[PDB]
Amino acid sequence: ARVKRGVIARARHKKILKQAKGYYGARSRVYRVAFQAVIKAGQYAYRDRRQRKRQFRQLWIARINAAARQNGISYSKFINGLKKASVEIDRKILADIAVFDKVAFTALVEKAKAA
Amino acid sequence: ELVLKDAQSALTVSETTFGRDFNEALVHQVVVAYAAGARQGTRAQKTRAEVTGSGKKPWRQKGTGRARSGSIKSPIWRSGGVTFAARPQDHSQKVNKKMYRGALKSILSELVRQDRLIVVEKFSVEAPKTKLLAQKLKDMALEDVLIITGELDENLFLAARNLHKVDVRDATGIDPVSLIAFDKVVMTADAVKQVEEMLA
């Protein structure tokens, strides 16, 4: 039994070309080139799920280090001061409090001062 | 024992022939083998040898900026090759006597459980006519059947050619696939006696 394979292949190519929808030049419109870009996009996607977590921590720490030095404390002392006062509040929130509620944030730095 | 639908007589048929555990694998293998036996398998493509053409090199080995070719007939080319060309082959496969009998014994016993096996006394149409056979099955409450008979009547045979869902086969010539395929199996008292002796 002969198996003509024109229907299946096109659906495989068309599936990947849909994933390349947006890319520049041949990347969007040429399977042979697209397929590389789509894989590489996956490779980078797998990687940057790990970097998302690194970058945001840096970003928060920068905000906390910025907001602390407003009140007269360096990040290194602040966090140690919180950990000596046994405060479990993370960077994500400290950074979010540091931006939104300054009047609130001040009390955390005043608490870290005590230790 | 096996009761009838127009007598209620106790036909004491053997235990191990019509009352054994349904072995699925054996039956499957035997019916698959029976199917495989039906194939004629008459087909052929032509290898690079068998294709019409010359054995000349289309262009020389080197110099020309092209992929080295040896003949027009090579399967990577168009219009000739088919790498592994099939030849007319025999797909039929061996089945062991005891396995074929064991499978028939296995399937024919399961019809007694499911009540597809409708054993009867004398079963024969009056004259060689389909209209009578078609009408008499409406009384018997049947449609898709394998009417197995010991004494194969030409009257009954001729009357069941044109009927699609009815099939008339001799007790000697029962098959694995047929007993499974059809919705009911009408066996004659003589046919049961013949098949009992045949399968043993």
């Binding site: - | 699925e24 039956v27 293998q29 499974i180 395929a181």
Partner: protein, 143 residues
């Protein structure tokens, strides 16, 4: 059971290795035959008993013996398949009809394979020491 409802026993079938079908197959690209060399090539591999040009075992060892012709036309009859002929007479032509020994077998011998019941007079046939003890203990007198 209907024609669709049937299925094979789990462990009966096992698909088959399909070479050259992508990475996900496992085998695929160099279908389980590594990179390069005589073994990797189509029609590859060496002949039987070839040890890379070193003198093969079947040549560096000396040939011996000779094939006996008398050994071809002699059988080793079991004591178990003795009483399967004609009551208790087992010469040669009688034993030959029972299909215990081949047609072209003149000489033959009965050995201690175990179990006799009936008295069998073993005429015109070579018989073993332990078999002679058994066959007579059953009842039948030899020769």
């Amino acid at each position: 059971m209907r024609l669709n409802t049937l299925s094979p026993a789990e462990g009966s079938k096992k698909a088959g290795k399909r070479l050259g079908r992508g990475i996900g197959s496992g085998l695929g690209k160099t279908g389980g035959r590594g990179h390069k060399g005589q073994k990797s090539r189509s029609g590859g591999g060496v002949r039987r008993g070839f040890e890379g040009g070193q003198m093969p075992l079947y040549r560096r060892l000396p040939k011996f013996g000779f094939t006996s012709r008398k050994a071809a036309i002699t059988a080793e009859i079991r004591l178990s398949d003795l009483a399967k002929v004609e009551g208790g007479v087992v010469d040669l032509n009688t034993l030959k009809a029972a299909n215990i020994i081949g047609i072209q077998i003149e000489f033959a011998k009965v050995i201690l394979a175990g179990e006799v019941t009936t008295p069998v007079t073993v005429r015109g046939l070579r018989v073993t020491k332990g078999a002679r003890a058994a066959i007579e203990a059953a009842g039948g007198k030899i020769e």
